[PDB]
């Protein structure tokens, strides 16, 4: 139904999911000088266990690592959140070249990729699916990826990409700690937004980290080697699987730091 191709891409999603034109859509272009410094915000804590990862999957839209979310062991708390949100999965958005790929932009600048750690309010909702539709249901932490030096921990993930190159394939992926993909700073920007893929529900509290992590061009290349297509189809590489910035519509972006 929807994708990132010329005929089914982001520019057309609004024809199938009208909420695409809503007042709290994501991603956005963060104008750093206009963010409101908010010291009242609590410190952001990403408390992640080392062995809660289950599998790695090419779902045709991105490569996603799923987690055991039966308890509150791997959660995000603090910052703009009232309580803990359990990590359900993480995935990425990337481009064909370095100048494009991320969903959020900062002062008009795009990064080659963006990592999304998707968490849900298990204290209020009974399931991730139920939470994905409520205003306070999800908390997504976004981390920008820049290309430069090789990222040691990333190797375990980029080396596994071959096994899920085709759409609809998956592999076991145990003991990968998502903390290894975080920068050494916990400063962030936060604003009320939405899922960046259909159904585009406005159920996400976005927490976009200020500091990007870096991976090598070789590692980035492993993502670009993935395919939107299945085994016996004409190969179309999975690239530019991102939604562009949406209207802010008067929302206020808060910052945990002074720029
Ligand atoms: N790019 S992003 O905003 O970080 C992001 C994060 C999470 C999701 C995602 O996992 N889903 C799948 C589940 N979603 C649903 O609306 C849903 C709920 C119940 C039954 C089926 C579905 Cl599709 C919401 C989208 C999709 C996109
Ligand atoms: Zn995403």
Residue 116's DSSP bridge partners are 91, 142
Taking only Cα atoms into account, the Rg of the chain, rounded to an integer number of angstroms, comes to 17
CA dist 39 and 255 (Å) reads 8
Single out the residue of 173, 140, 165 nearest to residue 60, CA to CA: 165
Structure determined via: X-ray
Q: Is 19 exposed, middle or buried (0-12, 13-18, 19+ CB in 10 A)?
A: middle
* C-alpha distances in Å from residue 52, one per residue of 68, 192, 207: 5, 28, 22
CA dist 132 and 25 (Å) reads 14
Pocket test for ligand 1, best of 90, 93, 129 (most atoms within 8 A of CB): 129
The answer to whether 213 and 183 are in contact (CB under 8 A) is yes
* DSSP annotation string for the chain: ---SSTTTSTTTGGGT-GGGGSSS-S--EE-GGGSEE-TTSEEEEEE--SS-EEEEEE-SS-EEEEE--SSSSSEEEEET-SS-EEEEEEEEEE-SSTT---SSEETTB--SEEEEEEEE-TTT-SSHHHHTTSTTSEEEEEEEEEESS--TTHHHHHTTGGGG-STTEEEE--S--GGGGS-S---EEEEEE--SSTT--S-EEEEEESS-EEE-HHHHHHHHT-BSS-TTS---B-----PPP---TT---EESS--
**Stated resolution in angstroms:** 1.6
Pocket test for ligand 1, best of 17, 114, 133, 195 (most atoms within 8 A of CB): 195
Domain that holds residue 239: 1-259
What's the total number of domains in the chain? Answer: 1
CA 259 to chain CA mean position, Å: 23
CA dist 114 and 147 (Å) reads 11
């Amino acid at each position: 139904g929807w994708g990132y191709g010329q005929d089914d891409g982001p520019s057309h999603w609004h024809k199938l999911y009208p909420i695409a034109q809503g007042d709290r859509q994501s991603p956005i272009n963060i104008i750093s000088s206009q963010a409101v410094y908010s010291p009242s915000l609590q410190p952001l804590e990403l408390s992640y266990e080392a062995c809660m990862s289950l599998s790695i999957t090419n779902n045709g839209h991105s490569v996603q690592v799923d987690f055991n979310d039966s308890d509150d062991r791997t959660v995000v708390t603090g910052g703009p959140l009232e309580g803990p949100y359990r990590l359900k999965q993480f995935h990425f958005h990337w481009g064909k070249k370095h100048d494009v790929g991320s969903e959020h932009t900062v002062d008009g600048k795009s990064f080659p990729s963006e990592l999304h750690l998707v968490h849900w309010n298990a204290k209020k909702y009974s399931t991730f699916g139920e939470a994905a539709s409520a205003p306070d249901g999800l908390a997504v932490v976004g981390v920008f990826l820049e290309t430069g030096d090789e990222h040691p921990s990333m190797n375990r993930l980029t080396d596994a990409l071959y096994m899920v190159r085709f759409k609809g394939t998956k592999a076991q992926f145990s003991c990968f700690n998502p903390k290894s993909l975080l920068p050494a700073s916990r400063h962030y920007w936060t604003y009320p937004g939405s899922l960046t893929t259909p159904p585009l529900s406005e159920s996400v509290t976005w927490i976009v980290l200020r500091e990007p992590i870096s991976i090598s061009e070789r590692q980035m290349g492993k993502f670009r080697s993935l395919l939107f297509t299945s085994e016996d189809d004409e190969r179309i590489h999975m690239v530019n699987n991102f939604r562009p910035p949406q209207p802010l519509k008067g929302r206020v972006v808060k910052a945990s730091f002074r720029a």
